[PDB]
Design a protein around this ligand. Sequence first.
Ligand SMILES: O=c1ccn([C@@H]2O[C@H](COP(=O)(O)OP(=O)(O)O[C@H]3O[C@H](CO)[C@@H](O)[C@H](O)[C@H]3O)[C@@H](O)[C@H]2O)c(=O)[nH]1
Ligand SMILES: O=c1ccn([C@@H]2O[C@H](COP(=O)(O)OP(=O)(O)O[C@H]3O[C@H](CO)[C@@H](O)[C@H](O)[C@H]3O)[C@@H](O)[C@H]2O)c(=O)[nH]1
Ligand SMILES: O=c1ccn([C@@H]2O[C@H](COP(=O)(O)OP(=O)(O)O[C@H]3O[C@H](CO)[C@@H](O)[C@H](O)[C@H]3O)[C@@H](O)[C@H]2O)c(=O)[nH]1
Ligand SMILES: O=c1ccn([C@@H]2O[C@H](COP(=O)(O)OP(=O)(O)O[C@H]3O[C@H](CO)[C@@H](O)[C@H](O)[C@H]3O)[C@@H](O)[C@H]2O)c(=O)[nH]1
Ligand code: NA
Ligand code: NA
Ligand code: NA
Lengths: 372, 367, 365, 357
Amino acid sequence: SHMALRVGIVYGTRPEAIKLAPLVLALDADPGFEPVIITTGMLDEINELFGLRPRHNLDIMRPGQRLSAMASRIVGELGDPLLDELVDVAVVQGDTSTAFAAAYAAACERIPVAHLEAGLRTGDRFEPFPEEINRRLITQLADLHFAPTADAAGNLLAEGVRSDDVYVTGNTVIDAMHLVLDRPGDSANRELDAFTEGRQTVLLTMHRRESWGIPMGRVAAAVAELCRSRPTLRFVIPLHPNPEVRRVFRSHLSSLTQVLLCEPLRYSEFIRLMHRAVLVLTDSGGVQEEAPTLGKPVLVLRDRTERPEGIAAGCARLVGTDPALIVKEVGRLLDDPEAYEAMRRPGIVCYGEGDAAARCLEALRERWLSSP
Amino acid sequence: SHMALRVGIVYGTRPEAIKLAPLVLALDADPGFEPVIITTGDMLDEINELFGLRPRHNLDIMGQRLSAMASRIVGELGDPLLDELVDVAVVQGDTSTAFAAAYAAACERIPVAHLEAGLRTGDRFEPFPEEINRRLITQLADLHFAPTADAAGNLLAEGVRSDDVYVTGNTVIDAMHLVLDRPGDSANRELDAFTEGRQTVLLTMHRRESWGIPMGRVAAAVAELCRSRPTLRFVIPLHPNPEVRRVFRSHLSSLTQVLLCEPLRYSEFIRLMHRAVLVLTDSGGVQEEAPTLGKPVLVLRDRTERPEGIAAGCARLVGTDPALIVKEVGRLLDDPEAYEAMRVCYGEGDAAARCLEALRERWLSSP
Amino acid sequence: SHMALRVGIVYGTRPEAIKLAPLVLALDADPGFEPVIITTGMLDEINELFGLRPRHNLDIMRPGQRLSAMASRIVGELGDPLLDELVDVAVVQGDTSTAFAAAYAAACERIPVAHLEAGLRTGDRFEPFPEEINRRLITQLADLHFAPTADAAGNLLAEGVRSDDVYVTGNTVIDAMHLVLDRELDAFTEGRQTVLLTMHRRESWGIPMGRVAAAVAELCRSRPTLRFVIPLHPNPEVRRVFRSHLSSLTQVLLCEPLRYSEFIRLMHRAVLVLTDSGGVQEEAPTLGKPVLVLRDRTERPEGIAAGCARLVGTDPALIVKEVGRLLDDPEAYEAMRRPGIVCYGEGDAAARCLEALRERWLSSP
Amino acid sequence: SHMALRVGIVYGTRPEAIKLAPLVLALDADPGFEPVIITTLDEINELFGLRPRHNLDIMRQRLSAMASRIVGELGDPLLDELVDVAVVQGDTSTAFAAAYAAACERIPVAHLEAGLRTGDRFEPFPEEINRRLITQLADLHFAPTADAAGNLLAEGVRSDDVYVTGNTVIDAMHLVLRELDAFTEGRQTVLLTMHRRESWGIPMGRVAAAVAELCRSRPTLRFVIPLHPNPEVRRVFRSHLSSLTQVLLCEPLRYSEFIRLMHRAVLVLTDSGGVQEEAPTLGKPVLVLRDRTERPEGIAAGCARLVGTDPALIVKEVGRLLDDPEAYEAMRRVCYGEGDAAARCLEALRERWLSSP
Ligand SMILES: O=c1ccn([C@@H]2O[C@H](COP(=O)(O)OP(=O)(O)O[C@H]3O[C@H](CO)[C@@H](O)[C@H](O)[C@H]3O)[C@@H](O)[C@H]2O)c(=O)[nH]1
Ligand SMILES: O=c1ccn([C@@H]2O[C@H](COP(=O)(O)OP(=O)(O)O[C@H]3O[C@H](CO)[C@@H](O)[C@H](O)[C@H]3O)[C@@H](O)[C@H]2O)c(=O)[nH]1
Ligand SMILES: O=c1ccn([C@@H]2O[C@H](COP(=O)(O)OP(=O)(O)O[C@H]3O[C@H](CO)[C@@H](O)[C@H](O)[C@H]3O)[C@@H](O)[C@H]2O)c(=O)[nH]1
Ligand SMILES: O=c1ccn([C@@H]2O[C@H](COP(=O)(O)OP(=O)(O)O[C@H]3O[C@H](CO)[C@@H](O)[C@H](O)[C@H]3O)[C@@H](O)[C@H]2O)c(=O)[nH]1
Ligand code: NA
Ligand code: NA
Ligand code: NA
């Protein structure tokens, strides 16, 4: 019956749910707090795995919808459930239009906002759009910023954020990984094991809209070429749920016995697969954080990254969508064990130790459960 | 957890559901595919229950203007196709659902396959809109499952590339075989009690162009045959339209020799057709099913999309002329040589497997 | 008071309005017919110039709208004005989603359809989308087809159209040009070799248009006497690519869309034309202007075969080379204007459409 | 017929219209540009000859509902009018929601009067956060002062995206330069405007009491108080001052009449941002009826002093200026530009969006 700080948790996508799940679990377990989940948007599957129970699902998001229409709906309609649920403080995560529109909706009701995973920057204006501008808008709206790294905290100060409002918590994705590594029952997959057992397996994920069509086609051609040249090499490619992404990989690779094209994997099964892989090709932000933590070299299928820490430490290299460079760089790592080891620093942490949820909780308690 | 080709299956009517059911079952059993059913149209629940079809979405779109119905399907089918992550969409036959759904799929750059492609009368806008629907679907579809060589030829004459056409045969033969293999579910006490010990004619008639006077002439032909042949019985399952029910009821409800029926479950309907001495119909599907059971067919139309049965002597056009119907039924009952002259046109019952292999070749292959 | 065949005319874009205008004028002048215009969608300006008076404007089309939503609205809502205006027959033009959705809406009311400019094909499935599929859908819906060329008539027969339903009328765009042939631009072009350039196709937005703009910049640097006039398609992304590449070049006049009369006068003064426009590929050869086509495919193969036009795509080196050849070698220039062939008709297409309509729908056996 | 850069101009209030008017006129006169106005006052539009292409009838109402409507509905007119670039002004929820709506359509945004800060988070709300959001959305920033340009750099804006243009309010004043005349003619007249929501009720009551006290103590002193059109603001001034013959309570004045009155006034008491810029330009000392200002330049130069809503301090500070000619002259003498801000904005627009490398 003692007062709980009621913490609004707003998300619409898989990566947000994964990164918020450890914070929701920590808020639930701590008697000083009550998490209140509102979704805007695969998601049921992540909710089931971590035991997240949304109080409200706004049925706002969908493929083939204008950004302005979606943002209009969130700004217009999120206020009522935030007020109805007596939210004291609202947490948003990452770079989504949900995170931006929900932070604004909360600000309109004078509900203080905290930003989970604050301060990631490429330094390329409106690239990608709208994610890069969303981060800069959330940064001005948020009272409190949970930065995953010292570098991200530095980016926040450069945008005029006061040092007292920035906490380097590390990234909750490390917490999330550790939670599913501790769940063998849920992690198991007969077909994936049978396909990877005794082979060098490359794990590949690619989803970014700016790479749709021709650039993804070049990456698929690089996969085909590596498979032809290296009969013992395998690829597992879990496909982003977009029909255009599925079509490009399917039309380039569906006949190659060396490639297992997959449906999206449950997070537990995906982390187990990543642990078994020899290396990871991705344009995913989260996989750039997860893979180095499992000691897997990462080749980044982009011309820019918001994870410069892995680049500077040699854990990750930019490869873009150049098929000759991808073939070369994957070859180097498979053929030269010294090049392979130079990309593994598996006793060094870029993105936190897996206690980020507890560091977020203590920041919330210091800011909103304290008096001078 | 391996990637499945997600195949949208869109239908609104009984004949579509019957012809798609064997393809749904084959897609379900094959690990390379996942069927996703979206309905637009309690006849259908009954077919879904019998074949174990489980719709993911029912749109509740289908006495309504064609333009309003087509507008709603074009407008609203895209969202469930995108939400269900459909890779490819299959439509069947000649319905406004098949056309509007093919168009809605094309708008989302979802490739379309047409089940039972290339049937033509050669009579423009007859019937309307079914004849034009086929020609529109033909231009929208990437892949065409033709039941016969003749149907494949009709597709090439409309500029379809030979590589996009597969002669699969008709899945209605697959569907028939599935319910012939289920005697327990095919049983019907009341039908057996009515037909036991008598020669039974099976009659179905539903086409809008025959409503009112033409159906009345067919009902008069039934009445005349019944008066002249006291031992003859008819079973007439009625299409669920009040005007069709009223014409048959007002002409035949007092004749002890006629059993007017509610629509029959497909299993029971095929068992009845197997027991019948001959079949009178304007149904496309029954023109395919009846010859496969060795039953002579008299076709209650001035045209057919099944010319193969006509050319092979399995079927004869009789239109809605009561004198000709009485004569032609009489000939078959009285002259065993005429009967035997009217006993594969439409495939071997492996059409679902041939569709699956065409889908795998087109959309589960890389160069 | 004698019965007129009431002919529905449905369009939503400038190119449709230009190509339908001569048919509307011929229908208006002939006592056997009454044109009834319904718009779905610059257009006021074309309506004013040719004296077109729409009976109904549906206000369906939009810059940022899903194809399915637009097609749904036309299928759903065009029937009411067609019935209210007692339309007997409907004419649609070209390859637009309006032409397809309106033909379908007309078919739903059992209103017969005629297709103006029928049978143009690349042979590249769904390229562009949805225009290539729209033509093939309209082709199945239309009772009557006005083909601009014998080649286009051949494409219709290969899709199962009966020969009696196909008339080679020629293209009404030639009629339209002739109607308009009977000040800042003048000052800019007067003493100078002027290239006219239009480019609008969605498949070329961004990088390909950037390459074309770079080709223009290179030609301007190498040839100080050369001028370009570039009327810009009204799309902000198209305007941005040309503006960001060319706005400082004194030799380039970037323009707002020109009124059709002013555009045809400019084309007559130009030394040559670079375009991805269908209509400009038909208009330019008729004024004896060599055309370089900024696409990898064309629906006007007649101009290619007759040497009037050449495909140049969006390859900047090839564009620089091909424009250079025509400016520098008067024999190469004359080879693209050789007399002796008329590709797209003589400018009597409206009258040939009218007589096909009278034969089909104002006759009894 | 040559291509013009089509510049969207979006505003919903009098202060925005006044500050945008000189930019609209400069865009209209220059052949390289075409202004396209979308509104979210008729009298200000008439005075400067502004002709809106579209009026969205959105403003009245919850902040979230208004912002939702602008984000949701402004895109269509921006696309229909073929806008190439969009300009927003000041700190309004219109300026923020319109900048966002433009960004959603990949229309580049310029912010007129960029970089004003108090440094007090969410004070006032939502104006202080609106500026910081517009700052991240805008490609181009027209800062009125070097101080404002410095505030933009501290929020990570690149120096190349910031132009110190000065404030277009000076341009607007220059463009405009009977009962009021009869009331002010032979007399020392104080001009007072006060409208800020954070001062409604008790604080405005204290300011009205200060006016009453000054009037009682100084029979020769007059006040003109044009009242903000809010019934609560009108009620507080009316109930405190309507019987005082030395106070003329007014309806809002047309901009030309307001600037003429300010020229005749001996000094100005205001919580208006624009009046803090206009008054020093006419050599009128300003006492600012707030605890903070976004115009620190006038404070530092001695043109303006903060007085808040403390009646004793207001009485004292007005007394000092009326009684001591040395204190008066210390508050008179450019803080906010020379009146060529429109032309400097135009040249920044031409350099950024009407140039090729
Ligand atoms: O089959 C799969 C593939 C991936 N994952 C997980 O999904 C997440 C990645 O999701 P993805 O769709 O690739 O998004 P990201 O690119 O990782 O995330 C973007 O969006 C987030 C929310 O705004 C931001 O935090 C990130 O910085 C930004 O890059 C990771 O935790 C992966 O382990 C699965 O569980 N199953
Ligand atoms: O009591 C009954 C009567 C019929 N049937 C079955 O229903 C189907 C026929 O349905 P019907 O309404 O008569 O439609 P058809 O006329 O067969 O089908 C039309 O519509 C189909 C869908 O577009 C096309 O494939 C056909 O060519 C076209 O003729 C057949 O399989 C019959 O066996 C029953 O199950 N029970
Ligand atoms: O500033 C300009 C530019 C062009 N035009 C005229 O506009 C037409 C060209 O319009 P455009 O937008 O380029 O479209 P097109 O590419 O010509 O037309 C497409 O759309 C038409 C309608 O479906 C089809 O007939 C064509 O085959 C197809 O290529 C021609 O008459 C030009 O002379 C002007 O009047 N002013
Ligand atoms: O009776 C009157 C009173 C004032 N004014 C004029 O109105 C403007 C002031 O408007 P006001 O309602 O007081 O608004 P401000 O407080 O000046 O403006 C706020 O809103 C603007 C737009 O967001 C920002 O530029 C400012 O920094 C911010 O303080 C000035 O130009 C005055 O000259 C009149 O014309 N008549
Ligand atoms: Na708790
Ligand atoms: Na399956
Ligand atoms: Na006429």
